[PDB]
Design a binder for this molecule. Structure first.
Ligand code: SF4
Ligand code: SF4
Ligand code: SF4
Lengths: 628, 628
């Protein structure tokens, strides 16, 4: 099987073979046939009476663990713990953002750059704004956001875009969210030996936990990031490994937390550091981003995107990365080993993510700019250790357009609003094109890479099929970066891949057929958008012809995302089977009974063409239900 | 090998064999050779790139997971998640207790029964008490306790018994606790794929999380339970399955949450329910407790203890249990299946612990007494379905003495205080006997049963060895219940098993050589006691000749307990190997390097006699260090 559809990826894999270094593909091959029990989710290790493995085939072999737990119980608890872990990752990201908001000041390193956005958020949090200092408002907003994480009395605060009907449905179902850390703790408590042994209740607890990610953690992280670093607008950038410069210092930012990458971008324009880069013999400083931190700095500043998850190692294989600065999440620990074969400084900066044999330079949030300058100076000084004979940068990079926040999308939609009719600054043109049938629907393509799928193949095939069927596509994360590398994030792509209705819409609004809405936490934006559409049409989000796809997901964060997208009322297709096939009841809940609960359900489909067909059929049947 | 050392357990196992029902022992046999990878902790399932298994033997086979994680990384993350799960269980228990405290009223079902204890706790939480209504104080105290769970700004509140030196050591090490749910979330975040890949940092994060269990969650749960339901004092009870009555309704309370069992005890004295029990042909109502809820009601009211963890099924095998009421934690799901073979009504009461095919009667905390009354009425009415031909209650019961809270221990120690010297109401007599060497030390025996060990064998052998070596023993949980069944919780036991110094101390103070300090959350009491001793001697808790033992542990809660006991500075012996042998670095950290950080470390010893010898040697070493 081919390892990737990306030519630059293939060239660097040949180079890695020539250099005698191992990749994620090599380790996947070394793992050989993976354990069937773990793959089906019928293995349990929740107590030291175990490990227990029960048969993935009902009626044969061992039926219960030592405590008496069935295959359905073991599967449901394993799934719930994946959701809890994903929720924890996203919530910790949002908590750091809220703490940064709490420390903003007029003369400090972290300021308020979008005051209108802050005032709207303050309105959503019942924070007074009129005749008040902007930083007093910011601190009050940060306090309310922080209380969302750990309040023990009262109800949490949810964005106004969330329909009232969806909230009432959640309350009736018993999944209405509480404080984020409280829900994570509840899931961890109920999976403990001898607690919850009922699959339906376990799945409902996991949905309840995932809601605190989708609508509170990721949402607050995104909106506070907009407040502090600016709301994204349409902006040009370049993507894929070709963005590395042979004659410049190459600094690659990998990870998820945006404050460090924002401070590194600011430090790169420091005159002393630019002079130092010139003095070490480089033309300048070339900042490139990877994964979600790359998505953030690219959405807000046009920083070039070096690559997505399964390309991170190959970035080092070029031999041109002088510094690789990582914060947390989706940072392959093998990088520490791999950087030994090159001059690269692999720099960890977060106390949450220590990696053995990496260079640890703790990013100081109290003095973010000075700390970022010190880290960047280490990367720049490493340019003297470059071995130019080992350098091979593929001449493969692609132009991309991104920055499509909900605000930017609304601004673009204002173009097709007749001034004599109005209203302006709404999602009404999008609702109109969806209701009329010019657009069949909207689909979110999100998720990681996975060695089980030819890298980027499923993302590209799913996106092309959807836009060919007049389904407008919004992309986040590594899927968005796969689209960027391929060339879908271009206005020209409208006439090259889209169907007639979507091509007309793209021409009228002057947008690409695929809209890059940011990082994984920025999936909250997608929720926001859908909610607005629903609130404009007076229906629940489960009545709309919308869907989400995770063609190549790998992370626990992806599991939590799919769970809260389904719980919000949006059908979700998974291109990688989750470890639930061992529990028939869990499969039936996720793919059949969920529709009775929240009006949406999971679809497991490993063939992208079949997934596109199923998405189109499901959207059409929801349209016929809605009468459009 | 033998299944148990308890004769009543053996008789009921013979009955279960005759009845054709399977027990935990049968399921353990069916599991056969358990997976070596999971047993060593070298299996990972944290992302869907996996499952990954690496060699438990370094230098052989597959070395890294697909992401590049080493065996040490996989082991450390698995261990950290066990700690997080145990912390979540204990913290959820304490959170329910704090909410119950917040809802106390003068004329309500839940009142304040120990005002002096509440005022001392309010002093510890900086809550004013002079000239204030008692319930206003209770509500303020509950608010402070709840803030300990989810505060995002500021420092948490810790009990005054914790030495200042231990706090400073924690701060220097970087494990000083934050809010409980925040620490659980942090641990779950750092184990996500591509985050923390450094074993030392991972272990430190797990220690930090476990501290929020030992000193905040369990501590607050215990103290608020004392405030609402009364501080335990010396009280007599009976233990083992013989406490069941053939001619009475038998109601067995299983689980951990004390509010439900307290309300059931109160409802059992209701005249209407007693009349109803008479009308169904029963002599009366016989409440019996199991596991930690049994420990709570037994400590506070002398409710008979039917048995510990691995006896729960056998309680049903008698055929005399009319109603088995369960709340959360350590409730074998197999009970539901087992209940079909008898008339027993298996009643789940908590939304956190749904069990398939059990009768669900949600315990309403808004009206706790009425809810308990209706649940108890269902149990009483089930007496008409008793089949007396299937009833076999072994005539094996044992007298026990319990109720040894720190307050009760201090009251007992006041007897050996010369009035002309004093002071009174301190732990000074205990400190004196420890310093003089009349007592060699104090050891806490805690933990569950585990089919891997002959049931109760390790508990009894460890306790007898320790008290024979003039080590006073405090017991909690299922170990305490094993001691109760065996007969160690008796004054006579002092002259039958204890060495000369401990026998003299028991005679002078009029206590058993083994002190039952309550449930698993009541291990906080042990911490409290040790802290007081340390504060009286002006030393850290790691300088004292104290130790903790978990001879037969199984639960994630036990892992968290051992972790915070070691982190507090108390050496801990584990009678069951935790899944860490696959990671050499993790083994070295837990058993060797930990002593450099916190002055204590783990000891893994599956032979109880060798464990007693090692405990005595380590205590003598610490005495020689201290000069006593
Ligand atoms: S919780 Fe039950 S099924 Fe899981 S390892 Fe423990 S005994 Fe086995
Ligand atoms: S999933 Fe379970 S059975 Fe399979 S290798 Fe891992 S621990 Fe062993
Ligand atoms: S986190 Fe790493 S070691 Fe664990 S399953 Fe995923 S790829 Fe394998």
């Amino acid at each position: 099987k081919a390892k990737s559809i990306d030519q630059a990826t293939l060239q660097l894999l040949d180079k890695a073979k020539q250099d005698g270094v191992e990749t994620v593909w090599d380790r996947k091959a070394d793992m050989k046939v993976q354990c069937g029990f773990g793959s089906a989710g019928v293995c349990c290790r929740n107590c030291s009476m175990g490990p227990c493995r029960v048969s993935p085939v009902p009626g044969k072999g061992v039926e219960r663990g030592i405590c008496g737990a069935t295959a359905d119980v073991i599967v449901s608890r394993n799934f719930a713990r994946m959701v809890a872990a994903g929720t924890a990752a996203h919530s910790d990201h949002g908590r750091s953002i809220a703490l940064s908001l709490y420390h903003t000041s007029k003369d400090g390193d972290i300021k308020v750059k979008d005051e209108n956005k802050l005032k709207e958020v303050a309105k959503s949090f019942n924070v007074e704004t009129e005749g008040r200092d902007i930083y007093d408002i910011a601190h009050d907003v940060a306090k309310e956001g922080l209380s969302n994480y750990g309040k023990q009395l009262g109800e949490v605060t949810l964005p106004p875009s969330l329909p009232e009907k969806r909230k009432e449905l959640w309350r009736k179902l018993g999944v209405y969210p509480r404080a984020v850390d409280r829900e994570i703790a509840a899931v961890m408590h109920s999976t403990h030996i001898g607690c919850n042994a009922d699959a339906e209740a376990m799945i409902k607890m996991s949905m309840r936990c995932s809601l605190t990610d989708g609508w509170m953690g990721s949402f607050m992280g995104t909106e506070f990031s907009d407040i502090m670093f600016g709301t994204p607008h349409s902006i040009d950038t370049e993507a894929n490994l070709g963005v590395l410069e042979k004659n410049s210092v190459n600094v690659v930012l990998h990870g998820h937390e945006p404050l460090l990458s924002e401070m590194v971008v600011e430090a790169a324009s420091d005159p002393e550091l630019v002079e130092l880069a010139k003095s070490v013999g480089a033309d300048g400083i070339n900042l490139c981003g990877m994964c979600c931190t790359g998505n953030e700095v690219s959405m807000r500043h046009g920083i070039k995107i070096a690559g997505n998850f399964m390309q991170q190692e190959l970035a080092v294989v070029t031999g041109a990365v002088d510094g690789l600065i990582v914060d947390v999440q989706c940072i392959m620990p093998a990088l520490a080993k791999l950087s030994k074969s090159y001059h690269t400084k692999f720099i960890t900066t977060s106390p949450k993510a220590h990696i053995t044999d990496s260079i640890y330079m703790e990013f100081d949030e109290e003095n973010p700019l000075d700390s970022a300058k010190k880290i960047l100076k280490e990367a720049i000084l490493n340019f003297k250790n470059r071995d130019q004979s080992k350098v091979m940068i593929p001449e493969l990079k692609c132009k991309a357009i991104l920055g499509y926040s909900v605000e930017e999308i609304i601004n673009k939609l204002d173009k097709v609003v007749n001034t004599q009719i109005g209203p302006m600054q709404t999602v009404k043109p999008l609702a109109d094109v969806l209701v009329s049938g010019v657009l069949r629907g909207a689909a979110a393509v999100v998720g990681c890479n996975n060695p089980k799928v030819v890298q980027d193949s499923a993302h590209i095939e799913t996106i092309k099929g959807l836009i060919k069927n007049d389904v407008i596509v919004v992309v986040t994360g590594c899927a968005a970066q796969a689209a960027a590398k391929y060339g879908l994030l271009q206005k020209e792509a409208a006439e090259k891949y889209a169907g007639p209705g979507l091509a007309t819409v793209c021409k009228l609004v002057d947008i690409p057929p695929v809209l890059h809405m940011g990082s994984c936490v920025d999936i909250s934006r997608i929720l926001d958008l859908v909610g607005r559409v629903a609130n404009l049409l007076g229906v629940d989000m489960s009545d709309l012809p919308v869907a989400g796809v995770a063609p190549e997901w790998m992370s626990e964060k992806a599991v939590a995302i799919g769970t809260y997208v389904v719980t919000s009322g949006i059908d979700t297709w998974l291109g990688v089977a989750p470890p639930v096939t061992g529990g028939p009841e869990v499969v039936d809940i996720l793919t059949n009974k969920m529709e009775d609960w929240v009006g949406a359900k999971f679809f497991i489909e490993t063939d992208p063409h079949k997934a596109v067909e199923q998405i189109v059929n499901r959207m059409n049947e929801k349209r016929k239900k809605l009468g459009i």
